[PDB]
Design a protein around this ligand. Structure first.
Ligand SMILES: *[C@@H]1O[C@H](CO)[C@@H](O[C@@H]2O[C@H](CO)[C@@H](O)[C@H](O)[C@H]2NC(C)=O)[C@H](O)[C@H]1NC(C)=O
Ligand SMILES: *[C@@H]1O[C@H](CO)[C@@H](O)[C@H](O)[C@H]1NC(C)=O
Lengths: 1622, 191
């Protein structure tokens, strides 16, 4: 008979292995095979002429191979084909399914967790069916955590290490589980998938740790679990009092972003001295709280997450434990290479294998084996139970039961008999075995032994062929067959030993078998009735020997490196190979890097191409061959494969509110009550409910739960009370950063290559991994950690900025990481403009593995001045750190209105070859501060907009306007888009002296990365939304469309998205008149009018706007349904503009029609309307523009432009520019290109996009004009400043800060072209009194520690509606060193009661944004602030609030964060320096409110002592030197030599008119330690006496000029210090 | 020349390959002999294949699979054949290639692969890697392993054999081969 083996499936592009081997007599005979198509044997893709003979034992092999044929998408092509073989003696073939999976996609993201703005490194290792390079073109597609695509890109496969382009995480991304999929561009269904998690980084206030009783939960504890949390500041000093909030929850796994929390999660065991603890009764805490009533029912995770809010500062810190596996039984059995089919007469083996809750092998466990059986005679048998014990080296507990030939199904249970494990938690498993049924009564059994868990390649497998049973022994030859990675790779024949039963077959283990393999062995048995094939088979796990041993090594093999060391790394291979380095901050993975495996991670996956299944052995010679992964081709036995195919799988008081979730009926109501009660005592419940929009459905859920929690706070409870009910809202925050990775290069290493480099200056354990791929396959190498780190180092905390003549406290901490302690000595460098206490080596001691606070007080008089060197000294180290100090003035206005259009050729209405900008000093100028002003001269009307995009990298907004809105994310793409549009659509790419083609790549990019930027604000329905998670705004959806449509010209945007984004407005938000309704409450503009008028107007404004959008973008989705809509819309506008209500309204209406049919008679009417409305400067027109009003001609165009002014005129200009109205428009752009400020469109956003578009689109419509002026910028009286020939070569020259105090003069020669002079002049004034207030404000600092309460009301302009403002922002400057309360603010925006919609602390400013500032009354933010450091005579910051879209509404106000008085005099600054820093003697007597101030002035870490003493020596005589005092009692032991009773001096020189200790009196003293001048012939120490020393009279007067109430406390304080320690 | 111990020492050796090497003939004895300065010494090369009677003139920078057959103390090493075109296309073919071990009635066979790293390839170099592989992965030249025949396929009806019992094929070591032509190798080992 013949046998022709082959896989169960074929694969396209797959070299399909097919052995043929046969029992034919002597006559040699040819054998050809090939692949032919379903029922017509016409197509034959390939074949093979492989001629066996008695020489080849009649056996052979062929590489058939079905390539690409049927490509028709939709046709179910390819499904099924025909295998064929040919000879002289027979011919036979087969119908057998096939597939499009060829190879493997391996997605190597550099690290697996990112934070906003990091750049994801990525590459792809890809292999084919043959685990070789597999060159192809591949395509991935990142998928945001919500499951919409977001990007895409293909790339070419030169070697197998496809290298894709970095994917920049959004400025403010969609936080959570990302997914990168990858597919083969061309044919082939093969799929890669990978993930990464985008979490939101937050700065940590103090280290919160959390440690659980043990690492799994087990029957033992489950009525308890000692979870210990430990809080501590970075300054080596534990938290004291703290408020702790721990909430638990269950969990399916650790790829599950979600987990069902659980009510009654203990609150407050207030942290206390750096620790708190609670035990967690899991039994209770799950039952009624989830489907989990038996612990049994639970072999999933327990989630813990604490929130520790510091009691003193009021800060807050969160921490979590992802999960903690629950466990029934701490062992886990699993059979081991023990096939589940019994051959009869053979004794059945059952090696079980015990493992611990940590998947290591565990020996010496006893294991019982009960088993159960029925006869073919249909009789049962309840076996006697056997017990063995698990081997020690093996982990295996091996059994064997001898089975009565007539056995059929055997059923076994298997358990551990831990003598100390209770019955329940004993570990168990069950299995079932069934007989190789064969009517020839014939069977087969093969096995083999080897004492170790893996067959080393090179070894030799002796494997025992026992044919037992077959009614007879007429066996000719035994034949085997070995597959691996889905392919047969060996096959052969041993002659059967005529005499005896069994023999051995000795197969070498070959490198081709490397991950594993299977073999199957058959003899062909001639039963008299019919030929029987018979065989058994076994799965062979073998050693993960690589093909190319790649091994990486570091040159200095030392286990620690210097933060900067140059160091050579080595590659290694036994065969030329491709490498692929990477150096991740090892810390990402870190926390229990689950054992699993490193290189087995890939091997596991990459061998699910093992078609087969099981430990081995079938059930029919079919089954046997089946599970092998094969179906075979042999006329004798049914080569069948019972239907379909075998999806084989792994056989081889706040609780009182929390009950009121009883009004579930939607998630949003949950959140409604939850954040409903939260904590709001500054307004009533129904005051908050008012602000609720989400739906009167949850308003009850809000007022209900709120009152409940409000009365409750009267009952749970100094004046410290703060309710809560934690829920991070399921947001992935992450209080630790992870540095960008490196060494991400590929390399060609022929057996060797070495490539030095010094590793990055940074405290990081660099795990530097390095996979390789070559013609053997993929081989990840053993990693190589390379932590770098410096032993001791200092950091200083400099502030952002300080005002001139504010006295600043400059802290820092010095790091000891050596195992022992040591001595340092940090000294700061006196830089010219900065006062200080030196006219010094204050050597301290740092306890080992810790850090000693450092500080310095300074005080700058010179503005802007920077630079301070810092130094420290250690026995074996002296190191210098440099720093730079931003110094500022007070209240900052910049007036730019100066500019010119240089027009030498009079093109524009006259000849501009001069403008003088002079000095104008505003009588509000802050003394001794120079007037800064910048000059920005460029060719082209479109030259600012060009210099802005090609002088700075990375896309950027064009104003000071705050990033909260989605609108700001959109406005970022703008200036690139317009630049790229003007650059490309007017071919001007030849501007570039450089390579233009690549300058173009850059902009496409800038354009794309910027486009994605917005996605976070894309909702699920395709509707975009103003801010994140904010109800869809009909408005921003349009504007998004508008800007998308625009950028589609040059960067294709996703069609399907844009369709639905479009299909959203029109299907839901177009009234039965054709106008569009806005959905959310977002007020974008405030229009003028009566309450009725407005709504009318407002409606136009939207409908016009949303047209321009659909209009702008319509072209990527011309869609019958939305053309209708466009018209019904267009209709309303024609039918509803023309009794024009505002010029602004008109203009959009106009520009919007302008983008459709621009001949409807009516349109021409409107354009008439509009065109009639305009105004003009000089006769004839040299300037035209429109004013916002409409023919109400108050005519206050008060020498000043305006966000809305520039807006409307851009709408006119844009309408006109459409109707190629060329001449009209000139004086219009003369006035824009002289309005826009240095850099870009100054007034707000919305105009600036239009005005830019205008400016561009016109410089496009009208021809350019070869630049060739000869500009000259020059001081009226001072010598000439610069002057340069302008040309099309350079026109976007440098700016220039005009230094000198003189009138300036730009002044081009004759020449030609158009150069825009802008000159944007900044100045600081002391006052607002002058300015125009559009908002009523109030602000001050409350004490009920300290907190800010800022308010505002909108002052309506005449004609205006009483509703209050449009989308607006409040902007509070914080006083120098006074952090705001992040959490307080989060509180305001983050709730259904949201008062604000967006907070942010940028550069020393809290910055809030909401849709309105009602005039009805005031609107108040409040939030608390902590004196981050000691500032000394602080100048005020400012509380400003303007309207986003019309900044012309800037009410500004100075305020201060403290009431502190106290006098001096001080001239030109030489005053606050003759007083170095010297100390302060608190006033005699004292006011109540101090038991709190007195303690705190103690252990504050800058207090290296606190000890009461009295002056025994202050030499009355003049010229005599410094103090010395006798100590009386020590509260905090100074870190210096002397003990209670001794005298210790006190030093200070120079005039200090600010404290005089009276000799013979006992002053209490508090400050840092004494300065050691260690030794140059023997002496001492003592102290500074600075500005936070609390030198203070101890009036032990006990009766004097009637003292008291100050002694009660110093006698209090006194016996209070030592005990409360610190 | 024949023996089992030796054939395990010559084919396990360090192979090398060179290019951009141009030289000008001199005949030592029979017909030819050459030399080249590789960057460390000064070698030698014996041309004597049927392709040499077309090249008694000299080498224009070809590819020379310079593996040592014997050596001089100065490091220079004699060699035979191994020359290829240059500019030699850096094509990389993954070729079929079987291996059946005979043991009288027994046969342990395996389907496999060979990697041809060029466009045209010298039968010397073809034979050196065809045996280097058997020596390190199929138990060649170690015990009863030493006799056999390599049947290279080249077209429906052609084959170039190589007895394994001896490396006496100095003169065809000049022959050259088209990479893409080779349909599939097939070895049979008789122990
Ligand atoms: C601290 O600051 C001073 C002033 O900048 C640094 O002085 C410079 O040192 C470098 C190296 O010798 C010189 O090239 C510069 O010219 C110096 N600057 C000037 C103009 O004084 C000094 O290096 C810093 N201290 C240390 C040790 O780095
Ligand atoms: C709160 O009110 C309840 C009911 O009036 C009262 O019994 C209880 O004393 C109060 N709670 C506490 C602990 O002060």
């Amino acid at each position: 008979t013949y046998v022709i083996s082959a896989p169960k499936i074929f694969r396209v592009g797959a070299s399909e292995n097919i052995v043929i081997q046969v029992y034919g007599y002597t006559e040699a005979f040819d054998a050809t095979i090939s692949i032919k198509s379903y029922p017509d044997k016409k197509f034959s893709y390939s074949s093979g002429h492989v001629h066996l003979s008695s020489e080849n034992k009649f056996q052979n092999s062929a590489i058939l191979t079905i390539q690409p044929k049927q490509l028709p998408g939709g046709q179910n092509p390819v499904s099924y084909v025909y295998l064929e073989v040919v000879s002289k003696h027979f011919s036979k073939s087969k119908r057998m399914p096939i597939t499009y999976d060829n190879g493997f996609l391996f997605i190597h993201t550099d690290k697996p967790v990112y934070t906003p703005d990091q750049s994801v490194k990525v590459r792809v290792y890809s292999l084919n069916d043959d685990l070789k390079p597999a060159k192809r073109e591949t395509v991935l597609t990142f998928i945001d955590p919500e499951g919409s695509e977001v990007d895409m890109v293909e790339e070419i496969d030169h070697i197998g290490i496809i290298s894709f382009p970095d994917f920049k995480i959004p400025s403010n991304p969609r936080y959570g589980m990302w997914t990168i999929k990858a597919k083969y561009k061309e044919d082939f269904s093969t799929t890669g998938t990978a993930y990464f998690e985008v979490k939101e980084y937050v700065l940590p206030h103090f280290s919160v740790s959390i440690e659980p009783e043990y690492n799994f939960i087990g029957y033992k504890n489950f009525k308890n679990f000692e979870i210990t949390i430990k809080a501590r500041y970075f300054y080596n000093k534990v938290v004291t009092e703290a408020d702790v909030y721990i909430t638990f929850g269950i969990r399916e796994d650790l790829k599950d972003d979600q987990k069902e929390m659980m009510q009654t999660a203990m609150q407050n065991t207030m942290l206390i001295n750096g620790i708190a603890q609670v035990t967690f009764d899991s039994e209770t805490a799950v039952k009624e709280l989830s489907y989990y009533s038996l612990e049994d029912l639970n072999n999933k995770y327990l989630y813990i997450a604490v929130t520790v809010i510091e009691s003193t500062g009021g800060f807050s810190e969160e921490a979590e434990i992802p999960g903690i596996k629950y466990v029934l039984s701490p062992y886990k059995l699993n059979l081991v290479a023990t096939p589940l089919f019994l051959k009869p007469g053979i004794p059945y083996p059952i090696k079980v294998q015990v493992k611990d809750s940590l998947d290591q092998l565990v020996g010496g466990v006893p294991v019982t084996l009960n088993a159960q059986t029925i006869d073919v005679n249909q009789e049962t048998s309840d076996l006697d139970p056997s017990k063995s014990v698990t081997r020690v080296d093996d982990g295996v507990a091996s059994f064997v039961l001898n089975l009565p030939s007539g056995v059929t199904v055997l059923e076994f249970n298997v358990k551990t008999d831990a003598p100390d494990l209770p019955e329940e938690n004993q570990a168990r498993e069950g299995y079932r075995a069934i007989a190789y049924s064969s009517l020839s009564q014939s069977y087969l059994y093969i096995d083999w032994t080897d004492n170790h868990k893996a067959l080393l390649v090179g070894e030799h497998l002796n494997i025992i062929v026992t044919p037992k049973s077959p009614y007879i022994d007429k066996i000719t030859h035994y034949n085997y067959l070995i597959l691996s990675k889905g392919k047969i790779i060996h096959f052969g024949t041993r002659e059967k030993f005529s005499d005896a039963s069994y023999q051995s077959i000795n197969i070498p283990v070959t490198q081709n078998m490397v991950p594993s393999s299977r073999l199957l062995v058959y003899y062909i048995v001639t039963g008299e009735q019919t030929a029987e094939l018979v065989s058994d088979s076994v799965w062979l796990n073998i050693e993960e020997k690589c093909g190319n041993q790649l091994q990486v090594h570091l040159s200095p093999d030392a286990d620690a490196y210097s933060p900067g060391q140059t160091v050579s790394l080595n590659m290694a291979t036994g065969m030329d190979s491709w490498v692929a380095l990477a150096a991740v901050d090892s810390a990402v993975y870190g926390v229990q890097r689950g054992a699993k495996k490193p290189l087995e991670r890939v091997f596991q996956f990459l061998e699910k191409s093992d078609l087969g299944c099981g430990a081995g052995g079938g059930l029919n010679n079919a089954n046997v061959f089946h599970l092998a992964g094969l179906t075979f081709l042999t006329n004798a036995n049914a080569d069948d494969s019972q239907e379909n195919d075998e999806p084989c799988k792994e056989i081889l008081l706040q609780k009182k509110i929390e009950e009121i979730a009883a009004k579930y009926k939607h998630s949003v109501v949950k959140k409604c009550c939850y954040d409903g009660a939260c904590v709001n005592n500054d307004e009533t419940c129904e005051q908050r409910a008012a602000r609720i929009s989400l739906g009167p459905r949850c308003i009850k859920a809000f007022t209900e739960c709120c009152v409940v929690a409000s009365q409750l706070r009267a009952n749970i409870s100094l004046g410290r009370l703060h309710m809560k009910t934690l829920l991070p809202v399921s947001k992935p925050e992450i209080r630790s950063y992870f540095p960008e990775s490196w060494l991400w290069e590929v390399h060609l290493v022929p057996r060797r290559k070495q490539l030095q480099f010094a590793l990055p200056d940074s405290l990081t354990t660099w795990e530097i991994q390095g996979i390789g791929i070559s013609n053997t396959g993929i081989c990840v190498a053993d990693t190589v950690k390379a932590k770098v780190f410096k032993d001791v180092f200092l950091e200083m905390n400099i502030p952002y900025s300080v005002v001139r003549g504010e006295q600043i406290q400059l802290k820092g901490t010095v790091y000891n990481y050596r195992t022992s302690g040591m001595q340092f000595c940090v000294k700061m460098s006196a830089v010219e403009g900065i006062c200080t206490s030196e006219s010094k080596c204050v050597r301290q001691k740092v306890e080992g593995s810790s850090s000693h606070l450092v500080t310095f007080t300074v005080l700058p008089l010179e503005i802007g001045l920077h630079n301070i060197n810092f130094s420290l000294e250690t026995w074996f180290g002296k190191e210098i750190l440099v720093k730079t100090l931003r110094v500022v003035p007070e209240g900052v206005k910049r007036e730019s209105y100066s500019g010119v259009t240089l027009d030498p050729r009079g093109i524009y209405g006259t000849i501009s070859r001069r403008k003088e900008f002079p000095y104008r000093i505003p009588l509000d100028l802050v003394p001794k501060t120079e007037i800064k002003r910048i000059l920005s001269v460029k060719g082209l009307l479109v030259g600012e907009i060009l210099s802005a995009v090609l002088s700075q990298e990375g896309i950027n907004i064009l104003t000071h306007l705050p990033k909260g809105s989605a609108e700001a994310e959109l406005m970022s793409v703008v200036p690139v888009f317009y630049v790229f549009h003007y650059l490309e659509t007017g071919n001007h790419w030849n501007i570039f002296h450089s390579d233009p083609l690549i300058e173009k790549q850059k902009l496409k990019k800038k354009l794309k990365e910027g486009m994605l930027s917005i996605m976070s604000y894309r909702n699920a329905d395709y509707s975009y939304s103003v801010w994140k998670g904010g109800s869809a705004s009909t408005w921003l959806t349009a504007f998004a469309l508008r800007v998308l449509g625009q950028v589609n010209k040059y960067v294709e945007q996703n069609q399907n998205s844009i369709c639905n984004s479009l299909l959203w407005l029109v299907e839901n938000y177009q009234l039965d008149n054709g106008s569009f309704k806005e959905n959310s409450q977002y007020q974008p503009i405030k229009l003028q009018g009566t309450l009725p008028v407005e709504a009318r107007e407002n409606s136009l404004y939207l409908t016009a706007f949303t047209v321009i959008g659909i209009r702008k973008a319509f072209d990527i989705c011309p869609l019958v349904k939305i053309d209708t809509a466009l018209i019904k819309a267009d209709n309303f506008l024609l039918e509803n503009t023309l009794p024009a209500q505002s010029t602004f309204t008109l203009a959009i209406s106009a520009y919007a029609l302008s983008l459709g049919d621009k001949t409807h008679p009516q349109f021409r009417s409107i354009v008439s309307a509009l065109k009639r409305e305009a105004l003009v400067k000089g006769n004839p027109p040299i300037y035209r523009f429109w004013k916002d009003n409409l023919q109400h001609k108050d005519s206050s165009v008060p020498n000043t432009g305006t966000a809305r002014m520039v807006e409307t005129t851009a709408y006119a200009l844009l309408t006109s520019l459409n109707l190629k109205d060329i001449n009209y428009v000139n004086p219009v752009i003369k006035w824009l290109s002289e309005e826009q400020r240095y850099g870009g469109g100054f007034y707000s956003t919305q105009d600036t996009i239009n005005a830019i578009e205008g400016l561009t689109e016109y410089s496009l419509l009208v021809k350019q004009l070869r630049l060739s002026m000869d500009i000259d910028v020059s001081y009226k009286h001072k010598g000439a400043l610069h002057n340069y020939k302008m040309t099309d070569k350079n026109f976007l020259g440098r700016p220039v800060e005009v230094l000198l105090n003189d009138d300036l003069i730009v002044s081009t020669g004759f020449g030609s072209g158009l150069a825009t002079v802008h000159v944007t002049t900044v100045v600081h004034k002391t006052s607002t009194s002058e300015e125009v207030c559009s908002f009523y404000l109030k602000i001050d600092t409350q004490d009920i520690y300290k907190r800010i309460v800022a308010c505002a009301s909108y002052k309506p302009s005449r004609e205006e509606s009483s509703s209050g403002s449009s989308h607006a922002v409040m902007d509070i400057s914080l006083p120098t060193g006074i952090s705001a309360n992040e959490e307080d603010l989060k509180a305001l925006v983050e709730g259904v009661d949201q008062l604000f919609t967006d907070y942010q602390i940028k550069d020393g400013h809290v910055i809030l944004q909401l849709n309105s500032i009602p005039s009805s009354d005031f609107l108040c933010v409040r939030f608390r602030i902590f004196e981050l450091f000691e500032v000394g005579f602080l100048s005020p910051a400012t509380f400003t609030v303007y309207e986003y879209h019309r900044p012309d509404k800037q009410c500004t106000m100075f305020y201060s964060t403290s009431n502190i008085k106290i006098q001096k005099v001080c001239e030109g600054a030489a005053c606050k320096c003759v007083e170095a820093d010297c100390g302060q003697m608190q006033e005699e007597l004292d006011l109540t409110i101090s038991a709190e101030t007195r303690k705190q002035t103690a252990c504050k870490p800058e207090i290296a002592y606190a000890y009461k003493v009295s002056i025994t020596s202050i030499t009355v005589e003049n010229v005599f030197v410094k103090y010395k005092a006798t100590l009386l009692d020590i509260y905090k032991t100074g870190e210096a030599v002397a003990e209670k009773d001794s005298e210790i001096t006190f030093i200070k020189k120079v005039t200090c008119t600010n404290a005089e200790l009276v000799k013979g009196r006992q002053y209490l003293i508090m400050g840092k330690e004494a300065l050691q001048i260690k030794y140059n012939f023997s002496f001492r120490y003592i102290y500074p006496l600075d500005s936070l020393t609390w030198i203070e009279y101890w009036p032990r007067d006990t009766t004097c000029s009637s003292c008291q109430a100050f002694l009660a406390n110093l006698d209090e304080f006194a016996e209070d210090i030592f005990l409360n320690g610190c | 020349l024949h023996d089992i111990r030796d054939l395990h020492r010559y084919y396990s050796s360090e192979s090398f390959e060179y290019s951009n090497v141009s030289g000008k003939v001199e005949n030592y004895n029979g017909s030819n002999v050459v030399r080249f300065n590789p960057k460390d010494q000064n070698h030698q090369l014996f041309l004597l294949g049927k392709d040499k009677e077309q090249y008694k003139e000299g080498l224009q920078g070809q590819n020379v699979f310079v593996v040592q057959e014997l050596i001089d103390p100065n490091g220079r090493l004699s060699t035979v054949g191994g020359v290829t075109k240059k500019n030699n296309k850096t094509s990389e073919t993954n070729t079929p290639l079987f291996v059946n071990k005979v043991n009288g009635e027994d046969l342990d066979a395996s389907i496999d692969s060979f990697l041809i790293q060029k466009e045209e390839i010298s039968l010397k170099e073809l034979d050196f890697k065809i045996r280097q592989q058997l020596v390190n992965n199929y138990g060649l030249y170690k015990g009863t392993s030493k006799y056999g025949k390599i049947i290279i396929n080249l077209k429906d009806e052609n084959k170039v054999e190589i007895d394994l019992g001896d490396k006496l094929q100095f003169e065809r070591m000049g022959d050259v081969l088209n990479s893409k032509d080779i349909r599939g190798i097939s070895v049979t080992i008789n122990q």
